[PDB]
């Protein structure tokens, strides 16, 4: 499913993401947008290390979810990567919360650094009623 901007904003809010570990909703929106274009079906194969990024947040199969074909897979979220391609993002959200609980926080995601960090990201939630 490809979420509409405000629709995703409200969904993330209901799931307790606003201010999670100090990360505003606008920052989460900026991340989802640049990772997948708000597309839950997005996947990206990393030919170099044999891993794959899944879903709306492009979570990686080496550390977070298990897809059975990634070398050195950790499965920190204790989820099948399949769970991250559902139209319902509840599982993706639970795993994205586990990710930022690491010392690096949202800084871990390079996409956030390249297009969200130190930039005005309020534009992502404006008009959504959140």
């Amino acid at each position: 499913k490809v979420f509409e901007r405000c629709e995703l904003a409200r969904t993330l809010k209901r799931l307790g993401m606003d201010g999670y570990r100090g990360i505003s909703l606008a920052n989460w929106m900026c991340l989802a947008k640049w990772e997948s274009g708000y597309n839950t079906r997005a996947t990206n194969y990393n030919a170099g290390d044999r891993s794959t990024d899944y879903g709306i947040f492009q979570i990686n199969s080496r550390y977070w979810c298990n897809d059975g074909k990634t070398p050195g897979a950790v499965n920190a979220c204790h989820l099948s990567c399949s769970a991250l391609l559902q139209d319902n993002i509840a599982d993706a959200v639970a795993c994205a919360k586990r990710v930022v609980r690491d010392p690096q926080g949202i800084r871990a995601a390079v996409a956030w650094r390249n297009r969200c960090q130190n930039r005005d990201v309020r534009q992502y939630v404006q008009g959504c009623g959140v």
Side-chain angles (χ1 to χ4, degrees):
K1 162 190 191 175
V2 180
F3 275 84
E4 283 189 280
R5 187 177 61 91
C6 291
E7 177 194 10
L8 177 54
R10 290 187 295 270
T11 302
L12 288 178
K13 188 156 197 296
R14 272 190 273 90
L15 295 167
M17 290 287 249
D18 194 23
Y20 189 81
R21 270 251 313 193
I23 309 166
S24 62
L25 206 65
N27 274 300
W28 285 116
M29 286 298 287
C30 185
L31 176 71
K33 186 195 176 299
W34 298 101
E35 290 289 1
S36 68
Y38 307 142
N39 184 6
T40 61
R41 303 315 251 279
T43 60
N44 178 57
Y45 184 56
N46 303 302
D49 68 0
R50 299 181 241 264
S51 71
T52 303
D53 302 313
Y54 292 90
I56 199 162
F57 289 127
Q58 291 289 273
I59 283 151
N60 190 266
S61 60
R62 170 147 293 113
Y63 324 88
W64 313 111
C65 69
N66 180 54
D67 71 5
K69 61 176 181 189
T70 305
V74 194
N75 199 13
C77 292
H78 296 101
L79 277 177
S80 167
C81 292
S82 162
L84 313 175
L85 299 173
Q86 296 179 101
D87 279 1
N88 180 293
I89 66 171
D91 288 327
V93 161
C95 183
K97 284 173 184 188
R98 171 59 183 82
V99 175
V100 301
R101 286 207 303 275
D102 270 2
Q104 199 166 25
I106 200 173
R107 217 140 305 215
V110 194
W112 180 83
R113 278 179 276 172
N114 304 337
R115 15 248 316 187
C116 309
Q117 182 186 233
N118 300 152
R119 306 179 180 242
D120 195 21
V121 298
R122 57 191 177 229
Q123 55 162 300
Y124 299 102
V125 304
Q126 300 303 39
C128 306
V130 298

